[PDB]
From a paper:
PgcA has been shown to play an important role in EET but is unusual in containing three CXXCH heme binding motifs that are separated by repeated (PT)x motifs, suggested to enhance binding to mineral surfaces. The first domain is not predicted to contain any cofactors, while the other three domains are monoheme domains (Fernandes et al., 2023). These findings show PgcA to be the first of a new class of electron transfer proteins, with redox centers separated by some nanometers but tethered together by flexible linkers, facilitating electron transfer through a tethered diffusion mechanism rather than a fixed, closely packed electron transfer chain.
The 1.8 Å crystal structure of heme domain II consisted of six copies of the protein within the asymmetric unit, comprising residues 352–414 of the PgcA amino acid sequence. The overall fold is the same within each copy and consists of four loop‐linked α‐helices encapsulating the c‐type heme moiety. The structures of domains I and II are highly similar, with a root mean square deviation (RMSD) of 0.453 Å and share 53% sequence identity. This suggests that PgcA domains I and II likely arose from a gene duplication event and that both the heme axial ligands and the histidine coordinated acidic residues are important structural features of these domains. Domains I and II possess two acidic residues, Glu281 and Asp372, which hydrogen bond the proximal histidine of the His–Met coordinated heme. These negatively charged residues might help stabilize the Fe3+ state over Fe2+, supported by the pH‐dependent voltammograms which show that these two domains have E m that is significantly more pH sensitive than domain III.
Author numbering: 1 to 66
Write the structure that this text describes.
Protein backbone atom coordinates (compact mmCIF):
# COMPACT_ATOMS: atom_id res chain seq x y z
CA UNK A 1 0.00 0.00 0.00
CA UNK A 2 1.42 3.37 -1.06
CA UNK A 3 1.93 5.65 1.93
CA UNK A 4 1.64 2.91 4.58
CA UNK A 5 4.85 3.65 6.46
CA UNK A 6 4.30 7.40 6.57
CA UNK A 7 0.66 7.00 7.67
CA UNK A 8 1.64 4.54 10.40
CA UNK A 9 4.34 6.92 11.59
CA UNK A 10 1.92 9.85 11.59
CA UNK A 11 -0.62 7.93 13.66
CA UNK A 12 1.81 6.28 16.13
CA UNK A 13 5.08 8.25 16.35
CA UNK A 14 4.84 11.84 15.21
CA UNK A 15 3.21 13.27 18.34
CA UNK A 16 6.48 12.65 20.25
CA UNK A 17 9.20 12.49 17.54
CA UNK A 18 8.10 15.10 14.97
CA UNK A 19 6.83 14.73 11.40
CA UNK A 20 8.58 12.02 9.46
CA UNK A 21 10.63 14.44 7.34
CA UNK A 22 11.74 16.25 10.52
CA UNK A 23 11.96 13.25 12.87
CA UNK A 24 14.37 13.19 15.80
CA UNK A 25 14.79 9.39 15.69
CA UNK A 26 18.38 8.23 15.32
CA UNK A 27 18.36 4.50 14.64
CA UNK A 28 15.76 3.87 11.97
CA UNK A 29 15.62 0.08 12.09
CA UNK A 30 13.07 -2.52 13.19
CA UNK A 31 15.35 -3.79 15.96
CA UNK A 32 15.88 -0.27 17.30
CA UNK A 33 12.15 0.45 17.33
CA UNK A 34 11.34 -2.88 18.94
CA UNK A 35 14.03 -2.33 21.57
CA UNK A 36 12.61 1.10 22.44
CA UNK A 37 9.11 -0.38 22.75
CA UNK A 38 10.33 -3.25 24.93
CA UNK A 39 12.30 -0.83 27.17
CA UNK A 40 9.31 1.56 27.39
CA UNK A 41 11.53 4.43 26.35
CA UNK A 42 9.36 7.49 26.54
CA UNK A 43 6.35 5.36 27.44
CA UNK A 44 6.45 3.55 24.01
CA UNK A 45 5.51 0.19 25.60
CA UNK A 46 1.91 0.82 24.50
CA UNK A 47 3.09 0.30 20.89
CA UNK A 48 3.26 -3.46 21.45
CA UNK A 49 0.11 -3.42 19.24
CA UNK A 50 2.17 -2.83 16.10
CA UNK A 51 2.87 -5.87 13.92
CA UNK A 52 6.37 -6.60 12.62
CA UNK A 53 5.20 -5.69 9.14
CA UNK A 54 4.05 -2.29 10.42
CA UNK A 55 7.36 -1.61 12.22
CA UNK A 56 9.16 -2.57 9.00
CA UNK A 57 7.03 -0.10 7.04
CA UNK A 58 7.76 2.67 9.58
CA UNK A 59 11.51 1.99 9.63
CA UNK A 60 11.69 1.90 5.82
CA UNK A 61 9.82 5.19 5.55
CA UNK A 62 12.03 6.81 8.22
CA UNK A 63 15.23 5.60 6.57
CA UNK A 64 14.06 6.98 3.21
CA UNK A 65 13.30 10.40 4.69
CA UNK A 66 16.98 10.93 5.50
C1 LIG B 1 5.79 9.58 23.21
C2 LIG B 1 4.70 8.86 24.03
C3 LIG B 1 6.49 8.69 22.15
C4 LIG B 1 5.93 8.00 21.14
C5 LIG B 1 4.45 7.88 20.75
C6 LIG B 1 6.98 7.39 20.36
N1 LIG B 1 8.19 7.72 20.95
FE1 LIG B 1 9.92 6.76 20.40
N2 LIG B 1 10.83 7.58 22.07
C7 LIG B 1 10.23 8.54 22.86
C8 LIG B 1 11.19 8.94 23.88
C9 LIG B 1 10.92 9.99 24.94
C10 LIG B 1 12.45 8.15 23.60
C11 LIG B 1 13.79 8.22 24.39
C12 LIG B 1 14.71 9.35 24.00
C13 LIG B 1 15.72 9.43 25.14
O1 LIG B 1 16.08 10.56 25.57
O2 LIG B 1 16.14 8.35 25.65
C14 LIG B 1 12.14 7.34 22.43
C15 LIG B 1 12.98 6.46 21.83
C16 LIG B 1 12.84 5.95 20.56
C17 LIG B 1 13.91 5.31 19.81
C18 LIG B 1 15.37 5.13 20.31
C19 LIG B 1 16.11 6.45 20.24
C20 LIG B 1 16.52 6.82 18.81
O3 LIG B 1 17.08 5.98 18.06
O4 LIG B 1 16.28 7.97 18.42
C21 LIG B 1 13.41 4.92 18.64
C22 LIG B 1 14.16 4.20 17.50
C23 LIG B 1 12.01 5.31 18.62
N3 LIG B 1 11.67 5.92 19.80
C24 LIG B 1 11.10 5.10 17.62
C25 LIG B 1 9.76 5.36 17.75
C26 LIG B 1 8.78 4.92 16.80
C27 LIG B 1 9.16 4.23 15.48
C28 LIG B 1 7.59 5.36 17.20
C29 LIG B 1 6.25 5.16 16.52
C30 LIG B 1 6.01 3.65 16.29
C31 LIG B 1 7.76 6.02 18.49
N4 LIG B 1 9.08 6.01 18.76
C32 LIG B 1 6.79 6.62 19.23
C33 LIG B 1 8.94 9.00 22.84
C34 LIG B 1 7.93 8.50 22.04
Amino acid sequence: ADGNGSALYGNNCQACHGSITNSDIQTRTVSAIQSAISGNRGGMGFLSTLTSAEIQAIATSLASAV
